[PDB]
Amino acid sequence: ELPEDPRWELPRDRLVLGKPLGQVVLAEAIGLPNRVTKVAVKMLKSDATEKDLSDLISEMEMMKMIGKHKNIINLLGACTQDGPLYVIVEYASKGNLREYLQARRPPEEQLSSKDLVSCAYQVARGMEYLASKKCIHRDLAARNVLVTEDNVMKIADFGLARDIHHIDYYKKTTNGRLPVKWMAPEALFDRIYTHQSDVWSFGVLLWEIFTLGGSPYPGVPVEELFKLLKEGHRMDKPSNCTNELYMMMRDCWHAVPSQRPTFKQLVEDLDRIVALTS
Amino acid sequence: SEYELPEDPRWELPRDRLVLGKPLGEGAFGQVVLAEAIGLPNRVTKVAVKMLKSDATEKDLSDLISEMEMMKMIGKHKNIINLLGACTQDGPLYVIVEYASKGNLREYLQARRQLSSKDLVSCAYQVARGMEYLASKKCIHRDLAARNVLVTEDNVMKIADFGLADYYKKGRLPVKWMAPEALFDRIYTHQSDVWSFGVLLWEIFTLGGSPYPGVPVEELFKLLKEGHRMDKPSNCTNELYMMMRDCWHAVPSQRPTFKQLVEDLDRIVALT
């Protein structure tokens, strides 16, 4: 059924499947000849539909088109013949960014201010590459940034298939948060997604970094969030965050999409700030 | 109180010695107007006059009288709105209190978003002192918030509505200042006031910030149960934040007393 692609195919016997990561399982790839590499393997569930199959294929195809970058979860290979489709991608042993930040809050080693700004920089770089490749994430948040054993930030789920005109606004994340809290007003209210709306989301992610995994608008339900947005509300400055970095967040949250900085600009600014950060 | 109220020579002021002025505020069935009092002996003092609205009932009268009497029992203090007199005979009851030209603390703070770090800590010290006094006088405020702290022309903080006789009545929600036991176990104590003071401290350091914006009552209840605490404001020392966190201790007996808070705030103001 699936078309062969010599560019990415890995023999099934080269993939030693292991512990479920989240369907995604950790595995060891032999070769990719006598070396194993820990990798993450994406596959469908037993009750997956043909639509589910198509979405997994689309994501893999999208990853192929987009190409590689140090700050995104990269495609490593695939098992598409005679068996379940396996989409092999990079493994991030330290989990998502939200978790990573929370685990390092003071009463695991505390992150320095430079560490925090560097985290933001890497994310902005991953996004800068994605935007250059014509990709709009649509759900940029710390939950969607994974951290490798070497502390490299990698944007995940950038090629995910999603029907925006079918998003359940009242649906929560696994951690119990509302994804609508990362959406630009034009994406939320008008269903218009752009690189500009991704920048707004990046502003929220910046906030998450400086609050060390903080939850935006705690206790605020969908309906109330709509009202806050309509009224032009902006979250307060996290303590232990410079006015400069807060200004950046506020610029990312400009009501006018055309007035927000681009990821290219953000990368340059963050590059500047990191170097100047203690 | 239908035909005449009891007389108290000690506080009575002749109506001719009081010229009513512009209204300062309307409430449920109460009205407050600015006025000029003469000889509280030929000098005029700008004062605030609390009276009933034309639609008030006997119960409302009882409530205004109970408040005046409480003010009498409590006595005077620099950081509370003090009773200056009353017109109880031959006409509407007027409870004359100190006037605070700079409005409530919330508005005072926002209008100056310019106070120094010492000014902000000083504000908290003054409020805690007013409260330490009220607490020494057995008075439990039950709604201590920046909105209930008035500021005089000389920038003196004065606790208001401490003698006053629906979780969804706002456009902020007062339940957001309530201690858990007071909100859940309807238990009001001097320590529940301490929790409220912590939220007031937060208001001071955010310069009139709105606690829990967009958070409805039901959601607050959930946040409270989860042990959720508001984040440390920017431009707030970890010490002052720990004080807030202290005031927000789940066990009321573990929260500091206003006497402690006054001592600490006295110390911090100096080191600021």
Superfamily of domain A2-91: Phosphorylase Kinase; domain 1 (3.30.200.20)
Residues of A in contact with B236 (CB under 8 A): 239
How many Å is the maximal CA-CA distance in chain A?
60
Work out the angle between the directed axes of helices A113-132 and A263-276 (0-180°, nearest 10). Answer: 160
CATH architecture classification, A92-275: Orthogonal Bundle (1.10)
CATH architecture classification, B5-99: 2-Layer Sandwich (3.30)
Output DSSP code: residue B46: E
Helices and strands, counts by H and E, chain B: 8, 7
Residues B130, B159: Cα–Cα separation, whole Å: 6
Cα–Cα distances in angstroms (integers) from residue B53 to residues A143, B29, B47, B93, in the given order? 56, 5, 18, 11
Backbone angles phi, psi at A80, to 5 degrees: -115, -15
Cα–Cα distances in angstroms (integers) from residue A90 to residues A38, A45, A129, A155, B126, in the given order? 8, 20, 17, 11, 59
Inter-chain residue contact B231 with A246, CB threshold 8 Å: no
Output DSSP code: residue B206: T
Q: Give B267→chain A minimum CA distance, Å.
A: 23
Residues of A in contact with B209 (CB under 8 A): 236
Kindly state the tokens that stand for B248.
């927000």
Q: Which of A217, A228, A237 sits opposite B234 (nearest CB)?
A: A237
Question: CA B158, B217, B160 angle in degrees (round to 5)?
Answer: 10
Q: List alpha helices for chain A, DSSP H.
A: 50-66, 97-102, 113-132, 185-190, 195-210, 222-230, 243-252, 263-276
Kindly state the tokens that stand for A52.
């589910």
| A90 assigned to a ligand binding site | yes
* Residue B139 identity: C
Inter-chain residue contact A241 with B234, CB threshold 8 Å: yes
Following DSSP, what letter does each residue of A123-184 receive, concatenated?
HHHHHHHHHHTT---S--SGGGEEE-TT--EEE-STT----GGG--TT---TTS--GGGGS-
Q: How many residues does chain A have?
A: 278
Strand partners, A24: A42
Q: Which of B213, B219, B232 sits opposite A233 (nearest CB)?
A: B213
| A240 assigned to a ligand binding site | no
Inter-chain residue contact B206 with A236, CB threshold 8 Å: yes
Residue from A188, A173, A172 nearest A225 by CA: A188
Following DSSP, what letter does each residue of B79-139 receive, concatenated?
TBPPEEEEE-SSSS-EEEEE--TT-BHHHHHHTT----HHHHHHHHHHHHHHHHHHHHTT-
Residues A216, B85: Cα–Cα separation, whole Å: 50
Backbone angles phi, psi at A230, to 5 degrees: -60, -30
Strand partners, B57: none
Q: Look up the CATH number of domain B100-268.
A: 1.10.510.10
CB neighbourhood size of B91 (10 A):
9
Inter-chain residue contact A214 with B231, CB threshold 8 Å: yes
Cα A18 to chain centroid, rounded: 24
Residues of B in contact with A176 (CB under 8 A): none
Cα–Cα distances in angstroms (integers) from residue A261 to residues A123, A251, A270, in the given order? 15, 7, 12
Q: Which of B219, B236, B241 sits opposite A219 (nearest CB)?
A: B219
Residues A26, A24: Cα–Cα separation, whole Å: 7
Contact A166, A228 (CB under 8 A): no
Residues A232, A230: Cα–Cα separation, whole Å: 5
Kindly state the tokens that stand for A67.
């190409």
Residues of A in contact with B214 (CB under 8 A): 217, 219-220, 224-225, 227-228, 233
Cα–Cα distances in angstroms (integers) from residue A203 to residues A11, A247, A256, in the given order? 42, 10, 14
Kindly state the tokens that stand for B135.
């607490």
| A68 assigned to a ligand binding site | no
Residues B137, B70: Cα–Cα separation, whole Å: 10
Inter-chain residue contact B215 with A219, CB threshold 8 Å: yes
Contact B199, B145 (CB under 8 A): yes
Contact A130, A115 (CB under 8 A): no
Each domain of chain A, given as residue ranges in start order, spans 2-91, 92-275
Output DSSP code: residue B142: S
Method: X-ray
CB neighbourhood size of A63 (10 A):
22
Residues B51, B127: Cα–Cα separation, whole Å: 26
